[PDB]
Design a protein around this ligand. Structure first.
Ligand SMILES: [Zn+2]
Ligand SMILES: [Zn+2]
Ligand SMILES: [Zn+2]
Lengths: 184, 171, 167, 55, 131, 222
């Protein structure tokens, strides 16, 4: 069909195959194949229990990969119920993908920056951290060890800075994996 | 760094010093409560300038304690560190966590993460020191250090130093 | 006066010239008028403190080499002031060690030479305190001087500061 | 055969939670299924939405 | 890549805050955020793999030209012409000698660009700028 | 040549219109690239000599080098009567911007001055050169006699007519912003229809611009 529709279909397929499980993949692929799809339609095609699609539909709505319509009709047998329709809103969905991956990159930068300030120390007895700025208020009279304010225990070294290269590698491995997303 | 600033302090006089030389008692308690006293707002206050004319106005009696509260305004030399400022000093202690440098009245502790990697601890020396391929840093050694972090409490100020920048270190 | 919380502000950094809201360039004195923030270099601070101590010794009475200077100021300290002088003793020792200039005329020459530049008090006090040699070293020691002083002017003013350095 | 087609990412299948038993196979119209690592999956999970109409 | 910073792995599309910062000693497509993350604390080695040159924070600048070789050629030309500025007035109208001086300037610029005789040309540049 | 081309690439990355003199261009190029005017003045000659003794069979890659050498020599040896215009948009209809750099000759007398300096007798001649006194000012040359002849006819061989309005007295004009006016387009179409009906053999219709002709003929067919 329309080439931009093909591109957004492949983008939604890629993000549901990457960041979501196989049942999510099946539900969103059914949504991309049949444009609108009610709850009985998902049940008939996928043989998925109502309680099983519960977390699936809840996650897909909370990420806005699919959206819901609350229309009820009048069938000839007059046993009408307020059924729900599941479909895809392409611009809101792609905008959600951009916002999610963008701010994910943003606080990955924040996490590696927080790793990039020097490590400081932490007290194993009280399980509380103390950075280098306030450890020098807690150094001893012998001027050798930082002693905890409560436990009075010599402070041990943390690892915020030894893992900076590991965080950079994880960032790189995120980026080369999400290269199709940015191209789309 | 050293500054000169207008300062104001609320000082409390016990009623036993309500004599004809109450102003002299006020000035002496100003001396041994301000000279060398550390405040985080205005830095280490070192010496009080213009001792002949110190602004002392009327002192309010506290309604329950019965003591007199004077709002004394004075001129004093202070020493306030700032982040990112290069100061000189002398080393007074060394350890495996780092070493403290003495600038003014304040000890700036330089952590072991903030020296060049060629420079390493040597505790076998007496006193223990830091040795590199080109220089040694020991006690009573002239050294130039940049302050890149300052914490200031109500009555205590502590600073963090680093010599990893070029054209720093021993002088 | 407004009662906003105004809890958001930039961290005090020497490179950005942010020294806090009460180390601004203008200071309201005890007489009510505004005045330039008085920032002292190390030798200037040593001379101001020594002048204050000898004036206080004169008031109490009415009411040069490194070795002799240290003992002279120690006797002056113990004669003038009473208790809690560990910090002031360390300041006196630190200033007599790292005092670039000896006497009032040389240091006042440094203040007038740096006031000919029309520069920040913090920056000129840093220039008078740090025993720098070259312009690029001055720029990397004080990041505040970036895009403020030309390189030739910087190297010449540090050249006569090196000339004014004595003993 | 469904198993190696699944790790070849040629087909799509759901399995029971008790055991990996295929019951219904589809066609994988998309790409490979294991492009994104699991810690990136949780790292994606860590974020949420403030509201609707701003974006 | 000419569009993204390989050190911090950020595209210009989602992150428009990246900039075309390079260094004269080693020209690397590196961003201002990477520069402030690494070299603000102190001087360090080149984060791109296969290079380990020491470099400073204050020497970074934005690249004017698109070509790395052109950028380094004009930077070397500036580093030569700052001390080599003889003109036809300095040569007193001797056109052939001015042409020969221009030959020598382009020869030493080409030699500094290609690194063929870098030690001898650096020594000649130093002993000619000492005057 | 490579650093000159890179300087040109930097100059075309400007988001607004630059209208500058060649002297200003040369000063900016000298301060940013250390390229002088005199090596630029020999650029085309040096490129021709280099290509000659490289004896290359293919020059389809070197056509743009001819363009650059021509630009360099022109903008180097000419400084008065010329202007460099850098436009961020070559055409405003395009979505993506396409920058263009135009080195334009503002004085039409520059190219024709050596002709009048070389040749003693020049007869400027046209069927429809008017006004005649415009050309000795617009091109710096002196004319010994300028005259327009009036053709003598037994009967008036040609009929010039100026039509300022349509058949229904609606005003007609071909200014470019109202080219889509249905009344004016209909009046021009009706005029052309009647003139085609009453003209025996041939009829030539001249339009102010090709885009105008394309638009009005397309909507005439519509
Ligand atoms: Zn503890
Ligand atoms: Zn980067
Ligand atoms: Zn490198």
């Amino acid at each position: 069909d329309r080439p931009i529709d093909d591109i957004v279909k492949n983008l939604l397929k890629f993000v549901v195959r990457g960041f979501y499980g196989g049942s999510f993949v099946l539900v969103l692929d059914a949504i991309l194949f049949h444009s609108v799809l009610a709850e009985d339609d998902l049940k008939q095609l996928l043989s998925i229990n109502k309680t099983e699609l519960g977390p699936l539909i809840a996650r897909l709505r909370s990420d806005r990969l699919i959206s819901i319509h609350k229309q009820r009709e009048y069938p000839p047998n007059s046993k009408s119920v307020e059924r729900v329709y599941y479909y895809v809103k392409y611009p809101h969905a792609i905008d959600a993908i951009k916002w999610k991956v963008h701010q994910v990159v943003q606080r990955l930068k924040d996490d590696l920056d927080k790793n990039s300030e020097p490590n400081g120390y932490m007290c194993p007895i009280c399980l509380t951290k103390y950075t280098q700025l306030e450890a020098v208020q807690l150094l001893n009279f012998d001027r050798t060890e930082f002693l905890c304010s409560l436990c009075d225990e010599p402070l041990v070294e943390d690892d915020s800075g030894k893992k900076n290269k590991e965080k950079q590698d994880k960032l790189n491995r995120l980026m080369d994996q999400i290269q199709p997303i940015i191209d789309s | 760094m050293f500054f000169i600033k207008d300062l104001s302090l609320n000082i409390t006089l016990h009623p036993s010093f309500f004599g004809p030389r109450m102003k002299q008692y006020l000035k002496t308690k100003l001396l041994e409560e301000v000279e060398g006293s550390c405040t985080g707002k205005f830095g280490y206050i070192l010496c009080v300038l213009d001792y002949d004319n110190i602004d002392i106005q009327r002192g309010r009696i506290l309604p329950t304690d019965g003591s007199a509260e004077f709002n004394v305004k004075y001129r004093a030399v202070v020493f306030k560190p700032f982040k990112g400022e290069v100061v000189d000093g002398t080393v007074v202690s060394c350890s495996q966590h780092g070493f403290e440098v003495q600038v003014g009245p304040m000890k700036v502790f330089v952590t072991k993460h903030l020296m060049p990697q060629d420079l390493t601890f040597n505790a076998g020396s007496n006193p223990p020191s830091y040795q590199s391929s080109e220089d040694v840093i020991t006690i009573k050694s002239r050294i130039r250090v940049k302050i890149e972090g300052c914490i200031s409490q109500v009555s205590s100020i502590h600073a963090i130093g680093s010599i990893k920048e070029d054209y720093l270190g021993a002088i | 006066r407004r009662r906003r919380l105004k809890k958001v502000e930039e961290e005090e950094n020497a490179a950005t010239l942010q020294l806090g809201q009460e180390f601004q360039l203008k200071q309201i004195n005890h007489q009510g008028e505004e005045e330039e923030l008085i920032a002292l270099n190390l030798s200037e601070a040593r001379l101001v403190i020594k002048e204050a101590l000898v004036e206080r010794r004169r008031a109490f009475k009415r009411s040069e080499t490194r070795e002799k200077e240290l003992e002279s100021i120690d006797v002056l300290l113990e004669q003038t002031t009473g208790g809690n002088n560990k910090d002031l003793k360390n300041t006196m020792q630190y200033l007599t060690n790292f005092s670039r200039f000896r006497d009032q005329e040389t240091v006042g020459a440094v203040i007038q030479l740096l006031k000919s530049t029309g520069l920040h008090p913090f920056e000129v006090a840093q220039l008078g305190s740090l025993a720098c040699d070259t312009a690029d070293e001055a720029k990397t020691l004080i990041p505040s001087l970036n895009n403020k002083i030309s390189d030739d002017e910087l190297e010449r003013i540090l050249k006569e500061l090196s000339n004014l350095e004595t003993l | 055969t469904i198993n190696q087609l699944e790790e070849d990412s040629k087909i799509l299948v759901l399995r029971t939670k008790k055991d990996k038993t295929p019951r219904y196979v589809w066609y994988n119209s998309g790409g490979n299924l294991k492009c994104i690592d699991e810690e990136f999956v949780k790292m994606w999970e860590n974020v949420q939405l403030p509201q609707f109409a701003e974006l | 890549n000419k569009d993204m910073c390989p050190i911090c792995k950020t595209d210009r599309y989602l992150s428009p805050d990246v900039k075309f910062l390079v260094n004269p000693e080693c020209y690397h497509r590196i961003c201002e955020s990477c520069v402030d993350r690494i070299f603000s604390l102190g001087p360090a080695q080149c984060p791109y793999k296969g290079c380990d040159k020491i470099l400073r924070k204050n020497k970074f600048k934005t690249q004017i030209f698109d070509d790395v070789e052109v950028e380094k050629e004009v930077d070397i030309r500036k580093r030569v012409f700052n001390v080599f500025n003889k003109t036809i007035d300095d040569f007193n109208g001797d056109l052939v000698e001015y042409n020969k001086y221009l030959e020598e300037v382009e020869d030493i610029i080409y030699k500094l660009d290609h690194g063929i005789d870098v030690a001898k040309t650096e020594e000649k540049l130093r002993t000619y700028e000492e005057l | 040549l490579k650093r000159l081309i890179e300087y040109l690439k930097t100059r075309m990355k400007v988001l607004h219109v630059i209208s500058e003199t060649p002297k200003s261009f040369l000063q900016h190029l000298k301060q940013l690239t250390f390229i002088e005017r005199k090596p630029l003045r020999f650029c085309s000659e040096r490129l021709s000599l280099l290509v000659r003794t490289l004896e290359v069979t293919e020059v389809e890659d070197f056509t743009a080098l001819k363009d650059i050498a021509t630009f360099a020599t022109l903008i180097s040896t000419y400084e008065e009567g010329f202007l460099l215009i850098i436009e961020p948009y070559e055409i405003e209809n395009a979505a993506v911007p396409n920058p263009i750099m135009r080195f334009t000759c503002l004085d039409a007398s520059i190219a024709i001055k050596p002709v009048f300096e070389r040749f003693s007798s020049v007869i400027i001649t046209s069927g429809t050169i008017s006004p005649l006194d415009m050309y000795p000012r617009m091109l710096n040359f002196k004319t010994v006699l300028q005259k327009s002849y009036a053709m003598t006819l037994a009967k008036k061989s040609f009929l010039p007519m100026i039509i300022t309005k349509g058949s229904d007295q609606v005003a007609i004009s071909s200014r470019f912003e109202i080219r889509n006016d249905p009344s004016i387009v209909r009046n021009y179409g009706s005029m052309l229809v009647e003139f085609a009906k009453i003209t025996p053999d041939g009829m030539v219709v001249f339009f102010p611009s090709y885009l105008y002709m394309e638009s009005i003929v397309s909507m005439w067919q519509t």
